[PDB]
Design a protein around this ligand. Structure first.
Ligand SMILES: CSCC[C@H](N)CC(=O)O
Ligand SMILES: CSCC[C@H](N)CC(=O)O
Ligand SMILES: [Zn+2]
Length: 544
């Protein structure tokens, strides 16, 4: 009955999707699929983040328009996410008319309400190319150790940090010219005016405790005005009434959540839902799934922007940790920096969805993809616990009972134990305690396989006159499988489809209360095969 808008962070246009992105998009998708199963109106929204200096320069280097380049990456990203069955209702772009109009609107409101300040700053400028240089586009000699060819504000030899204005013999990364300091008028968003509002949100108990604790450190350091303009040349949105000035990408980027929703509404011919979700008096819920590195933008700048422009604020932020592989940050040299597209050449989507879900919780801790453990866990849990209930039982039903399940449950008490678990499992999905849900589900799968072992169908099947017993046992196993696959439906969409085809039924949350009795099932070829370390070794080699 709820109306829910869920987003994931908008991926950078000039990088391929990797396993770190996938942690976020999978976490959100599992949650979204569960909410849809419980009957809510869910809108799952994303987009590519397509603006800024790096994108402008990369397109120039490639000799194509930035529009051509971002279009190609958008397609690549969407192909990858589709391969993982991420169920967006809309995937748009920050480079869109909807985002342009909303960015101009919000800026205009902020300005009228007194939250935009003008101040002149000094910044390094490449006089040959004719552009201001972000820090990482300045290189030079470390002032401390005198090592050459250091970029931006830090030295990768001695570890020193400094302003790029301190580099010896600085050079533009773009042209090789010596940059010089130049003045420019910038526009600033008055974040400090929202301090009290933001502190009250932090204290409210909605946010993850770890995020609220970090917010306190940020308040203690002191909020500052935020520079939200960039000079031409730029790839982005021009500021009304300010020729040669553009909105900084991070101003327009979260507005792209709104732009993507507006685009969806407009394509659907829906003239009411945008305001229903975004007006101050909204009764819809708004959730952003994000990583740790972008919390500042989403927890401070974004709710302040919304408040200052007469829009509702997020209901919650759901922050996750970083992905590690084999315990460490992804490493190109070790072949553990793994692209989403590469993953799918070696493994299916469900395997990674399962593994991440088994490790995820409501806290912000890092999630480790241990590749040896991945093989062991997928084989143990998917192949040998859950799918086993179907695979060990279906053959007898198809071959000796014409595909027809028994007319009554062999063990109604055991079935009730399984259905009674729905409340705790659903609460675990809802609360993002995914690992707890998976532990509960796998404890049930253990009980189901213990039931089948206790009945010993491999013995019953050879014994004269025991056909009815065999049908009973195997049907019971299949009914337990039906329940477990319902609980796992948000996690394993493709396996679920194959299970639904076998069972001749769509799996619904409430449907588990009616077991399959006197019911025809279909034959199947392997629902889920084992994986092995040779495949992991190939993945790693392909990623080097
Ligand atoms: C509105 S969420 C935007 C997220 C950024 N594109 C993440 C990044 O580029 O690192
Ligand atoms: C509480 S989450 C925000 C704090 C993170 N340590 C910021 C980062 O990882 O860049
Ligand atoms: Zn140095």
């Amino acid at each position: 009955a709820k109306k829910i808008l869920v987003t994931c962070a908008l991926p950078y246009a000039n990088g391929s999707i990797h396993l770190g992105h996938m942690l976020e998009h999978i976490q959100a998708d599992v949650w979204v699929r569960y909410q849809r199963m419980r009957g809510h109106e869910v809108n799952f929204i994303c987009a590519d983040d397509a603006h800024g200096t790096p994108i402008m320069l990369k397109a120039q280097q490639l000799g194509i328009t930035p529009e051509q380049m971002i279009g190609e990456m958008s397609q690549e990203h969407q192909t990858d996410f589709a391969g993982f069955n991420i169920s967006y209702d809309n995937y748009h772009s920050t480079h869109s008319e909807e985002n342009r109009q909303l960015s101009e609107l919000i800026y205009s409101r902020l300005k009228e309400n007194g939250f935009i300040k003008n101040r002149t700053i000094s910044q390094l400028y490449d006089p040959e190319k004719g552009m201001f240089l972000p820090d990482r586009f300045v290189k030079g000699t470390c002032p401390k150790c005198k090592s050459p060819d250091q970029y931006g504000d830090n030295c990768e030899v001695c570890g020193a940090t400094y302003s790029p204005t301190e580099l010896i013999e600085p050079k533009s990364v773009v042209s090789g010219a010596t940059p010089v300091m130049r003045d420019s008028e910038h526009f600033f968003f008055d974040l400090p005016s929202f301090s009290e509002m933001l502190q009250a949100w932090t204290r409210s108990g909605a946010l993850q405790e770890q995020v609220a604790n970090k917010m306190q450190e940020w308040f203690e350091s002191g909020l500052q005005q935020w520079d939200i303009s960039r000079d031409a040349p730029y790839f982005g949105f021009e500021i009304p009434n300010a020729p040669g000035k553009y909105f900084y990408v991070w101003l327009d980027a979260p507005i792209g959540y709104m732009g993507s929703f507006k685009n969806l509404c407009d394509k659907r011919g829906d003239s009411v839902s945008f305001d229903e979700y975004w007006k101050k008096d909204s009764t819809a819920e708004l959730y952003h799934f994000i990583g740790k590195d972008i919390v500042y933008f989403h927890s401070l700048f974004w709710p302040a922007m919304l408040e200052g422009s007469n829009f509702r604020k997020p209901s919650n932020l759901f922050v996750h940790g970083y992905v590690t592989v084999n315990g460490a940050k992804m490493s190109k040299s070790r072949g553990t920096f793994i692209k989403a597209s590469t993953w799918l050449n070696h493994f299916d989507a469900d395997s990674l969805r399962y593994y991440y879900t088994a490790k995820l919780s409501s806290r912000i801790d890092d999630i480790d993809l241990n590749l040896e453990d991945f093989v062991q866990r997928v084989n143990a849990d998917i192949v040998n616990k859950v799918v086993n209930l179907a695979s060990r039982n279906a053959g007898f039903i198809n071959k000796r009972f014409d595909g027809v399940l028994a007319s009554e449950l062999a063990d109604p008490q055991l079935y009730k134990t399984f259905t009674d678990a729905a409340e705790v499992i659903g609460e675990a999905w809802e609360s993002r305690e995914f690992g707890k849900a998976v532990r509960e589900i796998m404890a049930l799968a253990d009980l189901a396989n213990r039931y089948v072992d206790e009945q010993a169908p491999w013995v019953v099947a050879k014994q004269e006159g025991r056909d009815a017993d065999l049908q009973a046992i195997c049907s019971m196993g299949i009914n337990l499988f039906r329940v477990l696959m319902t609980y796992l439906k948000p996690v394993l969409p493709k396996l679920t489809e194959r299970a639904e085809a076998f069972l001749n039924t769509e799996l619904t949350w409430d449907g588990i209360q009616q077991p399959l009795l006197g019911h025809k099932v279909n034959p199947f070829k392997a629902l889920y095969n084992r994986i092995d370390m040779r495949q992991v070794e190939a993945l790693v080699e392909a990623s080097k």
